[model samples]
Target: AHHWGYGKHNGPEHWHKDFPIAKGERQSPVDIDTHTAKYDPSLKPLSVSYDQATSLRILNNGHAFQVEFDDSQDKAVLKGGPLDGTYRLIQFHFHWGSLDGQGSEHTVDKKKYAAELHLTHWNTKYGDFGKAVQQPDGLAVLGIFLKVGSAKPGLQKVVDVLDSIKTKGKSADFTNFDPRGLLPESLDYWTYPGSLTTPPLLECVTWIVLKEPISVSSEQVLKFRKLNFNGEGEPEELMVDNWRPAQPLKNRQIKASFK
Candidate 1:
């Protein structure tokens, strides 16, 4: 189930206590700077193929627009896909700082970005998200950092829908939105095993963080800061800053794959 809140009830500090071992065991927001390069040329590049079953489902879970996909879509560009087996796109969501200067999952030299996009996928070999959470290589998450620069064509589609769901608990219907359109041309990325940054911090994900940052206009970043926090009938609270503080690295080494 999805949940939302701030501070003790909804803040990062209480995430461990909210979901128990399954959520507390492996928490995210980890510092990525300490990671060293450990490239393996022999590893097979990650690949996915899209089938007729491809479909998009959007959810307004009080925070951001969470879009989930069906198993029909699959493709991989990196060697050794995040997971040990085939992965299918599941859902994608965003996290942002209240302002345009600081809201990203992983940081660059301890610096934050305007926003971050998480493209979540599941290992079909494990059957479902529930089962995938139990496997080391059961999930794959593609992390893209958003910076305030020139207008970005890739984000135009999402920006077009911002007004429709300006308030919390409000959702707009969307279809045929191609996620690949948001991917930057460069696929160079850092890979590592990590847990979900949100509640139920399952440690089944293989993270691929893009090296290049995507550009978004300052206006676009401002629009994101206006999302509502309370549902209908409740006074809407502006989602000014929804970022979790950076977590420890836990002595884990991160790897990068360059073509």
Candidate 2:
């Protein structure tokens, strides 16, 4: 199998060799140019509801730390907005930087945030997430920008568990956590057709990135930098710059939910 990482060797630049779709149109983490974004009055407010009990566990997947959920039922769902069908929340994760400044994937007028959170969901019309990822409208991912400012008690709950999953493949039970707390008050967003930022680079995601960003302390951002990309027995390589840079828009139009 082909291996990939954030290093110069196996990073984004080298991904096209193995995953041909990397160079395809509608790739993810695009720069959200507000001036060019056309506001659509037809766009509805995003309705998201999550059950705290749905959060199963948190794990370090060598790339980023993700909190997986019980997707068996529609316990957690994201609807309305630019989405046509009900999308079930499967997991949520973050992408941050080694330093304070340039960590977020999608930028606002070329400005980067300290971090970004992706709440991944799959359409029930496809039967399962595996089959869903193969369709153009199968995945609906919510992108929330994270800036370093005031501390959030909801975010602190997630940061507190980082130590338990410091290395690759490490995980811990993270139950009774509500993901809705991580979202900003405003549901205003820019919707576009995009792909997964990671490997296989599937172009099946309907990206709904929020206009408002939530806050996190500088200290909380540092905890995410301490996680290792290496597994228990491998060399210690800090997992920094886990995000893929902004991809080309190419024949795609980004639509705004608000003017």
Candidate 3:
């Protein structure tokens, strides 16, 4: 069976056996060492303008909860930064480890955070998100690290709906929420060529990881842990530590937006 889960048997260590590309050259979620990261003056300021109306639904697809967006038009789009063309927001999801610490997919100077948010976008020139994901410059994902501290009201809005989608394959009508509120104060970031953190694990992403982390409370982190990875009839299994370990750099350069 081609199955994968975040458990002792089917976790990150075993992913390479099934999805051979798990050991590929341009894998994602690499540890970002500040000392080795280079500041590229040629990189432009990132421009992300999202329309609140683009918010559609939220789902717990076993791995993580995703908030879907209406990508039919150029309603919410990401431009500038290391991106050459406009990319539209499709959906956003999260990865976490423990309740209040050590859950982020990408690390900074060997430091781990409470959680990490992935805002996935697809380049418009590739026609659609499906076809876009196949191209090298087609997908641009914004990675925002989450730390536990002061109460994050914006993140709380999404957390409040977690109870509705407690089990796998469950979803709810989630709309009118602006994803922009989820971002931190600064837009400074590190850009790199990487792949999807999850399998398929295609090396078709242009990752833009924010230097600043948005704060969430421990209480909020606990709510996400309540989500179940199994379906209604299956055995009970709570979702936690659904993050992949950092991959090798493999000679790829990490470009920074600011010094």
Model 3: how far is 103 from its true place, Å? Answer: 0.7
Give the alpha carbon lDDT tens digit for every residue of 1-259 in model 2.
8589888789989999999999999898899899999999999988887753389999999999999999998889999999998899999999988886888999999998989999999999998999999999999999999999898779988999999999989999998898878989898899999999999899999999999999999888989998999999789899888889999999999999998
**Pairs with steric clashes in candidate 3:** none
The segments of candidate 2 whose C-alpha lies over 4 angstroms from its true place after superposition are: none
Write out the backbone clash pairs for model 2.
none
Cα lDDT tens digits for candidate 1, 1-259: 5564553476776666666643343456555663456675644545534333333556666767676566543442222554465677777888888777788978866878888898887777777778988887888888898988888885787777877777665666666777766776677677777787766667777888888888889888888777677676688677656767666656666776654
Q: In order, what is each prediction's RMSD in angstroms?
A: 3.0, 1.0, 1.1
**Number of clashes found in candidate 2:** 0
Using all chains and alpha carbons, the TM-scores for the candidates as numbered come to: 0.86, 0.98, 0.97
By TM-score, the better pick of 1 and 3 is 3
lDDT for each residue of candidate 3 in 86-193, tens digit (9 for 90 to 100): 899999999998556588999999899989999999999998988987888989999999988887888888999999999999999998889988999999999999
**How does model 3 score by TM-score?**
0.97
RMSD of 2: 1.0
Candidate 1 Cα errors over 4 Å, as ranges: 1-4, 7-9, 20-26, 39-55, 72-79
lDDT of 3 at 142: 99
- Which window of 10 residues has the lowest lDDT sum in candidate 3? 47-56
